[PDB]
Design a protein around this ligand. Structure first.
Ligand SMILES: OC[C@H]1O[C@H](O[C@H]2[C@H](O)[C@@H](O)[C@@H](O[C@H]3[C@H](O)[C@@H](O)[C@@H](O)O[C@@H]3CO)O[C@@H]2CO)[C@H](O)[C@@H](O)[C@@H]1O
Ligand SMILES: [Ca+2]
Ligand SMILES: [Ca+2]
Ligand SMILES: [Ca+2]
Length: 545
């Protein structure tokens, strides 16, 4: 329940704060900005992976689960971070990455060392077929999901990069070692986990070929490994052996789960996590189809209420483009950022803020493929260019869909590198840091930052915004997303003009008292309650008694 009332903040540590001038974010950098997060009103910090890693996938390829990434600092730095976070009245959850390890993990170095060795079946090995890979599966990062090992003459599976071999969850020995490691972290007193790629741990037995109607080189392979039957056996055991033993929060990153099939994932009784990140609203690739967005988020609001589950609320993370670009408007950047904030943050659930979201940071456009880092898009570029795609065609995909958009340095001020670093940043800063930064926004009472500050405050001050029941209003309005939160004798009315235009809207009224809790436009003198005249991306929240 503390995790129900919590507001969470996600840190991408490589890009949060550099404290020693090598252009790479680090743990002492995070410590140095804890005031910012405490003052914002954050309850829980989720930090992206900080473990020993070759960084083929920036921390998600782990070579030692119990050692800190050299770029980021030492275990002593981590211990200091956790101690400072806890003394500041905040909690910290770690990123648990146990679908796969680095290919430089000791387990894998042993596993690949000989066809027969005790660690061989810690990973997923198969001999080729017809002088090719064991099957036609594509990696999520493009190319084959199998990599050949010359020494042992067999392929190993990798859903993600070539340097992220999948762990074999059918091996009891693997599972036991993973559980020990998880509990080792929980014994230090961290407050839980965000659980990475967790819907991918069950593979269809025998790894059969997938249908290939378009005759591709490799077939997108989600139907072979994403949320496959049999996965719950593993996740139930994971919960029993680790999470259930501690008072923590878990949020699983669970692609391939829909609102009608979320029962085993998040139900109050028997669910294997407290909440999950679901992906259904994050794949609407214009004028945004607002009503489709209403349908999806409402499905999840209603769906989880029915089974006493809990939603994880979010519009941004390190895997997505910026939400002003995705869901709002660069033509109305500050207004749409606040509209989007009120929209997603005040539904029933635990809201997450991704670093820079609270500033209205936006997508970047670098001209050189060398300026980017994302292993997924670097692979895409190589593969598609060979196929004939032009540089422009490919950069359009990277600019418009690439997750590097969310990994540019956090924009603290207008000093060199937006104050992220004294050196040369691992990833270039967005030039718009001269306009978009924490320092500027702290001083402006109508900043995006201070709007998030207010959102956090009203949610904490009014129980209806935490536990109140959601109901969608005005479903058929293609511009206005409106909904209520109802708890006993209090009703909150959230009104979001999700369009770049002025709109009229009839107040969806029966109250003894009405109060405006938040608004991103000045209130108009002569405007009547009944007849809303909303500016582009105007949002208002009313509290009704
Ligand atoms: O540790 C590897 C990788 O894992 C995490 O993200 C992955 C998701 O778990 C996985 O389901 C898949 O999700 C993307 C889908 O491929 C795509 O169709 C669409 O739904 O966007 C999803 C989000 O990107 O792949 C992602 C990795 O792209 C973790 O969060 C990643 O940082 C990490 O690289
Ligand atoms: Ca550094
Ligand atoms: Ca099994
Ligand atoms: Ca008006």
């Amino acid at each position: 329940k503390w995790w129900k009332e919590a507001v969470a903040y996600q840190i991408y540590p490589r890009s949060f704060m550099d404290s020693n001038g090598d252009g790479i974010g680090d743990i002492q950098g995070v410590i140095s900005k804890l005031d910012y997060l405490s003052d914002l009103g954050i309850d829980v910090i989720w930090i992206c992976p900080i473990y020993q890693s070759p960084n083929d996938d920036n921390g998600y390829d782990i070579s030692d689960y119990k050692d800190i990434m050299k770029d980021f600092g030492t275990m002593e730095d981590f211990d200091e971070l956790l101690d400072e976070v806890h003394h500041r009245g905040m909690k910290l959850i770690m990123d648990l990455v146990i679908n796969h390890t680095s290919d430089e993990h000791p387990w894998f170095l042993e596993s690949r060392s000989a066809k027969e060795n005790p660690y061989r079946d810690y990973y997923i090995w198969h001999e080729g077929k017809d002088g090719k890979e064991p099957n036609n599966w594509e990696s999520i990062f493009s190319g084959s999901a199998w990599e050949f090992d010359e020494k042992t003459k067999e392929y190993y599976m990798h859903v993600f990069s070539k340097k992220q071999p999948d762990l074999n969850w059918e091996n009891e020995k693997v599972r036991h070692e993973l559980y020990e490691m998880v509990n080792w972290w929980l014994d230090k007193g961290i407050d839980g986990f965000r659980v990475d790629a967790i819907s991918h741990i069950k593979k269809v037995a025998g790894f059969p070929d997938l249908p290939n109607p378009e005759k591709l080189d490799y077939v997108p392979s989600f139907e072979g490994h994403m949320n496959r039957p049999g996965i719950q056996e593993h996740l139930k055991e994971l919960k029993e052996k680790t999470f259930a033993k501690y008072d923590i929060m878990t949020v699983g990153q669970a692609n391939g789960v829909t609102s009608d099939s979320a029962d085993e994932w998040v139900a109050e009784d028997g669910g294997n996590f407290n909440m999950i990140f679901q992906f259904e609203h994050m794949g609407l690739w214009k004028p945004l189809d607002l009503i489709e967005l209403k349908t999806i988020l409402t499905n999840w609001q209603n769906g989880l209420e029915k089974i006493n589950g809990w939603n994880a609320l979010y519009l941004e993370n390190h895997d997505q483009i910026r939400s002003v670009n995705k869901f709002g408007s660069t033509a109305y950047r500050v207004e749409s950022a606040k509209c989007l904030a009120a929209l997603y943050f005040l539904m029933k659930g635990t809201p997450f803020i991704y670093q820079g979201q609270e500033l209205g940071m936006t997508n970047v456009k670098f001209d050189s493929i060398d300026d980017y880092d994302d292993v997924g898009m670097i692979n895409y570029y190589r593969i598609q260019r060979e196929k004939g795609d032009s540089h422009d065609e490919i950069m359009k995909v990277i600019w418009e869909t690439g997750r590097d958009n969310s990994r540019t340095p956090m924009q603290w001020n207008t000093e060199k590198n937006a104050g992220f670093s004294t050196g040369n940043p691992w990833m270039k800063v967005n030039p718009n840091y001269v306009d978009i930064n924490v320092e500027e926004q702290k001083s402006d009472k109508n900043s995006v930052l201070n709007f998030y500050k207010q959102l956090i405050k009203i949610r904490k001050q009014h129980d209806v915004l935490v536990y109140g029941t959601y109901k969608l209003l005005a479903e058929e309005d293609s511009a206005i997303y409106a909904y209520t939160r109802t708890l006993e004798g209090k009703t909150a009315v959230v009104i979001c003009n999700m369009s770049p235009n002025n709109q009229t809207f009839e107040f969806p009224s029966s109250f003894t008292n009405i109060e405006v809790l938040i608004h991103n436009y000045p209130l108009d003198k002569n405007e009547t309650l009944e007849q809303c005249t909303l500016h582009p991306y105007e949002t208002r929240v009313y509290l009704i008694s």
